[PDB]
Amino acid sequence: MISYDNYVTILDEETLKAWIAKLEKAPVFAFDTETDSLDNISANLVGLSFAIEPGVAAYIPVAHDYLDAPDQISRERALELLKPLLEDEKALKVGQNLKYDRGILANYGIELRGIAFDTMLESYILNSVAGRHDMDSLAERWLKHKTITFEEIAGKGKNQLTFNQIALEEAGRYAAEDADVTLQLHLKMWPDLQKHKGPLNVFENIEMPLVPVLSRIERNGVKIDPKVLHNHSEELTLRLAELEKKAHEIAGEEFNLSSTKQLQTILFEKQGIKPLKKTPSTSEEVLEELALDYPLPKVILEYRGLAKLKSTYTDKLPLMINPKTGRVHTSYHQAVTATGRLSSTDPNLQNIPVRNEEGRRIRQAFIAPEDYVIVSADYSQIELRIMAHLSRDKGLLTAFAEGKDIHRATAAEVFGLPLETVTSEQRRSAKAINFGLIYGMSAFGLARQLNIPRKEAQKYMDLYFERYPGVLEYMERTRAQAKEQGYVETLDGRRLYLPDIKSSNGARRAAAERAAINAPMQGTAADIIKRAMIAVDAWLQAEQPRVRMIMQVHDELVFEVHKDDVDAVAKQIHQLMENCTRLDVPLLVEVGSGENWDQAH
Ligand SMILES: [Mg+2]
Ligand SMILES: [Mn+2]
Ligand SMILES: [Zn+2]
Ligand SMILES: [Zn+2]
Ligand SMILES: [Zn+2]
Numbered sequence: 001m002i003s004y005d006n007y008v009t010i011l012d013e014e015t016l017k018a019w020i021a022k023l024e025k026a027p028v029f030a031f032d033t034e035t036d037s038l039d040n041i042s043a044n045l046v047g048l049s050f051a052i053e054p055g056v057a058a059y060i061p062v063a064h065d066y067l068d069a070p071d072q073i074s075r076e077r078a079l080e081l082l083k084p085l086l087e088d089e090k091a092l093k094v095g096q097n098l099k100y101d102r103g104i105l106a107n108y109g110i111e112l113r114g115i116a117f118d119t120m121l122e123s124y125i126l127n128s129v130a131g132r133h134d135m136d137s138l139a140e141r142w143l144k145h146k147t148i149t150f151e152e153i154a155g156k157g158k159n160q161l162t163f164n165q166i167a168l169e170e171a172g173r174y175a176a177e178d179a180d181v182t183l184q185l186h187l188k189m190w191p192d193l194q195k196h197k198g199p200l201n202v203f204e205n206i207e208m209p210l211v212p213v214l215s216r217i218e219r220n221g222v223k224i225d226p227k228v229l230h231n232h233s234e235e236l237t238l239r240l241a242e243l244e245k246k247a248h249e250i251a252g253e254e255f256n257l258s259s260t261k262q263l264q265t266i267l268f269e270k271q272g273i274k275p276l277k278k279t280p281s282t283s284e285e286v287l288e289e290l291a292l293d294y295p296l297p298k299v300i301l302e303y304r305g306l307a308k309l310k311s312t313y314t315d316k317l318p319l320m321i322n323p324k325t326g327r328v329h330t331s332y333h334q335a336v337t338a339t340g341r342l343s344s345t346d347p348n349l350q351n352i353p354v355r356n357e358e359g360r361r362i363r364q365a366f367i368a369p370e371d372y373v374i375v376s377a378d379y380s381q382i383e384l385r386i387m388a389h390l391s392r393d394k395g396l397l398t399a400f401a402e403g404k405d406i407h408r409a410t411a412a413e414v415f416g417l418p419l420e421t422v423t424s425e426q427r428r429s430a431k432a433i434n435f436g437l438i439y440g441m442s443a444f445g446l447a448r449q450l451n452i453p454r455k456e457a458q459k460y461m462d463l464y465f466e467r468y469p470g471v472l473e474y475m476e477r478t479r480a481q482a483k484e485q486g487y488v489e490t491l492d493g494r495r496l497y498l499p500d501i502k503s504s505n506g507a508r509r510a511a512a513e514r515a516a517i518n519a520p521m522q523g524t525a526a527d528i529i530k531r532a533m534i535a536v537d538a539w540l541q542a543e544q545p546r547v548r549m550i551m552q553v554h555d556e557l558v559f560e561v562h563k564d565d566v567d568a569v570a571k572q573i574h575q576l577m578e579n580c581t582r583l584d585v586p587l588l589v590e591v592g593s594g595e596n597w598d599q600a601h
Pocket of ligand 4: 382383554555
């Protein structure tokens with residue numbers, strides 16, 4: 001176990017000051033905060049823990065208020081004595097998910113500096129796919145130590161206690177162990193993170209500096225109009241009713257809009273071909289093939305889609321508005337994706353349909369406050385530009401260089417015809433090839449996206465590789481080093497380990513080869529986006545203009561800018577994004593604005 005003998009519980013100023021003195025001369029120190037809620041903006045700090053050396057850690061309770069809780073240093077007195085140390089950029093701190101801790105302190109007017117090491121990110125940069133990067137998983141992987149779980153001291157279910165309700169000593173065991181373990185994890189991982197300059201570079205200049213900027217974006221939140229979302233909800237109810245009637249009217253009787261049950265009994269029973277369509281799906285959608293002529297499958301297609309969107313965003317979004325700020329605070333995850341891109345939840349901004357009309361209405365609900373406007377800064381087809389650079393292809397490089405539409409430029413080369421005459425179908429064919437290459441799509445998978453026969457798709461890809469030889473080379477070379485060293489890297493050095501590259505399993509090894517071609521372009525896009533965020537945030541902090549960075553979704557950064565400042569600010573965001581990141585890839589940033597996210601998008 002871990003008893004009350006392990007760590008000290010600081011209940012007096014004199015002892016706290018003794019520790020602050022030791023903390024001041026430590027080379028690095030682990031630090032952690034305890035609160036009464038996972039919600040950063042409204043959580044209250046219940047206590048703090050520190051670790052100066054493996055096995056030497058302490059817990060300082062400041063707001064435990066259960067019946068008869070012992071005297072504790074007051075939250076205000078503890079923070080004023082600790083403030084200088086916390087705000088000192090020279091005092092280096094180590095922590096697990098420091099983004100959270102930085103925010104809690106910000107609730108009390110404290111600016112946490114010296115945010116040097118985050119064990120979550122150390123683990124993530126070492127090997128993004130090694131497993132989960134949370135402390136409990138980390139302590140077990142690297143230290144063969146099983147940590148005290150929050151459930152162990154607080155309980156489970158609705159009757160679960162909040163930190164302020166837990167006994168001082170019990171809270172101490174948990175909090176001081178976090179600090180201690182975090183320091184031990186750093187001592188084991190930091191030395192390893194130096195065996196390679198690639199990962200070390202990404203960790204030091206991309207991931208760590210991004211920690212406080214993610215905190216600031218999350219805490220800023222985004223303005224959502226609940227009325228608009230409600231109208232959209234009422235209207236969708238009516239549209240779902242109408243659509244259901246249109247389905248019944250086309251055939252007979254009533255039925256659910258569920259395939260492999262009520263649909264096959266209608267659809268193919270009235271002429272068609274037996275198999276159904278899985279909601280596997282992004283490759284063989286039987287329902288949308290029939291949709292080009294057959295009416296029923298087209299209405300069932302649209303019905304399901306609207307049903308999904310209503311319960312996911314229309315009904316959910318209004319419930320996420322924080323009472324304290326009046327805004328929605330999404331959760332960004334910095335150590336979850338395999339390629340290094342940021343993910344998002346509650347809400348998952350990336351699942352809002354882009355090329356769909358309803359998704360546009362969801363976006364219209366993201367509004368700018370009075371006298372402000374929503375500004376969108378996007379990296380135009382960054383992955384494609386990255387592939388152009390990685391393949392060193394003069395053809396692609398020149399297309400982007402002279403500002404031509406790469407999809408029409410590619411079609412003009414593949415099909416051999418003037419750029420002005422390329423048709424929509426030809427452009428659509430080249431476009432499917434271009435994005436297919438990024439995901440390492442098979443010549444048959446391209447046929448399923450283009451609806452053309454196999455070997456006809458193969459005919460296009462051979463014509464493509466002949467016109468753009470540099471792309472085949474990159475593809476072959478990347479699969480090469482992937483087998484030679486078990487991993488692939490981005491331009492900045494970020495690595496994706498591929499354990500199934502020599503799998504001996506067929507499909508399992510195919511996946512690893514696709515990931516081999518894909519990761520370098522996706523990871524590089526990710527690195528670029530993170531560098532722009534740090535650069536834009538740095539300008540924001542230094543110059544203090546009337547602008548907030550509110551979102552990050554796909555390849556765009558969304559802001560709130562004062563209406564009278566839009567022009568100067570747009571010039572600035574634009575320069576920072578395509579000139580203060582990587583100077584090797586030919587980058588283009590498209591900046592737009594409006595009353596809501598949809599207008600600026
Ligand atoms: Mg191309
Ligand atoms: Mn913590
Ligand atoms: Zn903790
Ligand atoms: Zn993208
Ligand atoms: Zn420019």
